[PDB]
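Quick note —
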Amino acid sequence: GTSKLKYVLQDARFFLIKSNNHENVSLAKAKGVWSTLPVNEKKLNLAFRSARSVILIFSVRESGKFQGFARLSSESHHGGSPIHWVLMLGGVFKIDWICRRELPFTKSAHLTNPWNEHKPVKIGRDGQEIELECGTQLCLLFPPDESIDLYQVIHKM
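Predicted structure written out below.
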C-alpha cells in the first residue's frame, strides 16, 4: 500500500542529496546515517525542528538514477564512531530508510522543482530543497520497498 507512505510525507520537507560515489550511499543504507557539509548541515538541522518529517532523496552522480529516500530521525551530532566515508564534514544524522529501491531519471522527467527555477527535479546541487508537491510526487514514483515497515517510522513523528 501507499497510505502509510502518504501519511509520512504529509507536510514533510524534502532535500536532494547528491553523492559522488555509490560507496557512501551503500554505507548510509547499511548504517542508517548521513553526513554533509556544514552549510547543508545547518539547513537540515533547521528543517528537522521545523517539520514532522524531513526526507532526504539520494542520487549518485553520473548514475542517472535516485537510489532511494530516507527520513531524518535526529539532528546532527558529533563524537560517535567514525564512518569510513569515501571522501570538513559536519555531524552525523541518523536516518530511517523509507525506500531503498532505485528510480531512473527517465521516470521523473515530468517533475520540476519550483525552488530550483523549475528545472527537472533530478537537477540540483547537493542540499537543494525540493518543493512540497514536487517532492511528494517524486517519492510516490519509487517502486514500493516491501522490506520496510513504516509503522515504526510513523511512531517517531
